[PDB]
Design a protein around this ligand. Sequence first.
Ligand code: HWL
Ligand code: HWL
Ligand code: CL
Ligand code: CL
Ligand code: CL
Ligand code: CL
Ligand code: CL
Ligand code: CL
Ligand code: CL
Ligand code: CL
Ligand code: CL
Ligand code: NA
Lengths: 114, 114, 114
Amino acid sequence: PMFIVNTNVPRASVPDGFLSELTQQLAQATGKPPQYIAVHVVPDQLMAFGGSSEPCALCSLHSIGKIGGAQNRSYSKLLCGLLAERLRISPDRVYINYYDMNAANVGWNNSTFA
Amino acid sequence: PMFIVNTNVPRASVPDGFLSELTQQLAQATGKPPQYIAVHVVPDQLMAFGGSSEPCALCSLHSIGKIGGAQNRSYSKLLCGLLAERLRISPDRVYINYYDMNAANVGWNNSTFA
Amino acid sequence: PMFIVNTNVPRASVPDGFLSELTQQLAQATGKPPQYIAVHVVPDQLMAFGGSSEPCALCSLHSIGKIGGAQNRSYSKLLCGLLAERLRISPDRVYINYYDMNAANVGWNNSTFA
Ligand SMILES: Cc1c(-c2ccccc2)oc2c(C(=O)OCCN3CCCCC3)cccc2c1=O
Ligand SMILES: Cc1c(-c2ccccc2)oc2c(C(=O)OCCN3CCCCC3)cccc2c1=O
Ligand SMILES: [Cl-]
Ligand SMILES: [Cl-]
Ligand SMILES: [Cl-]
Ligand SMILES: [Cl-]
Ligand SMILES: [Cl-]
Ligand SMILES: [Cl-]
Ligand SMILES: [Cl-]
Ligand SMILES: [Cl-]
Ligand SMILES: [Cl-]
Ligand code: NA
């Protein structure tokens, strides 16, 4: 799986260890080994949400399976909680798009997972 | 909805008010409230279009519904017009990918829209 | 088509000519004219893969058609090979998501490809 967070919060406010925390919490949440979890945080972005440039986060989670109605509600509660505690972004300013990828459409290690 | 523009034009060439114009014009085009709209502009990117490093943009619009053949033609005319007028990017050096999101695949405020 | 690479490799380690090499190789691989190939490289990113900050890449290829089981295996060998040769990223630290776009969902030049 791959989790990407784009945010207007400054780089210095991303705590040391945040990528590791995302890696471990997503490995547990998705039930996949951490070897397969990639995370990417992009601070200092020029963005607005609802017309306001107060702190916000625009995110995506792509996974081969482990995506669905109940699972995504669980991920949204987990990820909003982490972004609130660690980046001080209010949960009503976190927006997450979820993607269930087919294995044939994910490349890795010179081939694909199909 | 979420609208992202990635471009090689420099940050200083992004005029004041640009995120607000995107929010307001996308609210009218999609019919969605400005409250639900996120906009994100990423200048100074290392990009080429058609083998050329002249000004270009790669963009995406994600929305729960309000995506379709006629609507996407209308969005493309609106958004290329804004990128030409405000960033001086030729419309034939702009790509916009459109994504009709299922409500269950959009998280916000500790939940999803399922 | 559009190919995007996000990587933690520093900008100085992206060799001269890399975007042009990607354009030409993807034009041949997808069978589309180079005029239609857009490429975007994002170095210096804050990313982890498998819990490690060793060099890695998260990429996507979007194309109207020319996406499939066999084709995506071929693209993955080609692109992992380029990332290993040119950016020194191990293929087991690369993900590439593939997107077969409907023509109506790709905007260009004030309209769409539909
Ligand atoms: C930001 C925000 C959003 C929103 C966030 C991200 C993306 C989209 C919207 O939805 C909301 C919503 C709500 O339900 O938006 C969507 C539900 N909607 C039902 C019918 C079909 C289309 C989807 C309600 C109150 C405040 C809000 C709100 O303050
Ligand atoms: C992410 C990552 C992965 C990996 C990614 C997804 C799934 C599985 C692994 O494998 C690796 C590997 C590796 O799997 O190598 C195999 C050889 N290995 C040699 C020594 C004895 C055991 C076998 C090596 C280095 C970095 C890595 C590495 O950074
Ligand atoms: Cl995955
Ligand atoms: Cl970190
Ligand atoms: Cl589920
Ligand atoms: Cl939406
Ligand atoms: Cl339509
Ligand atoms: Cl969806
Ligand atoms: Cl295409
Ligand atoms: Cl195929
Ligand atoms: Cl599509
Ligand atoms: Na506004």
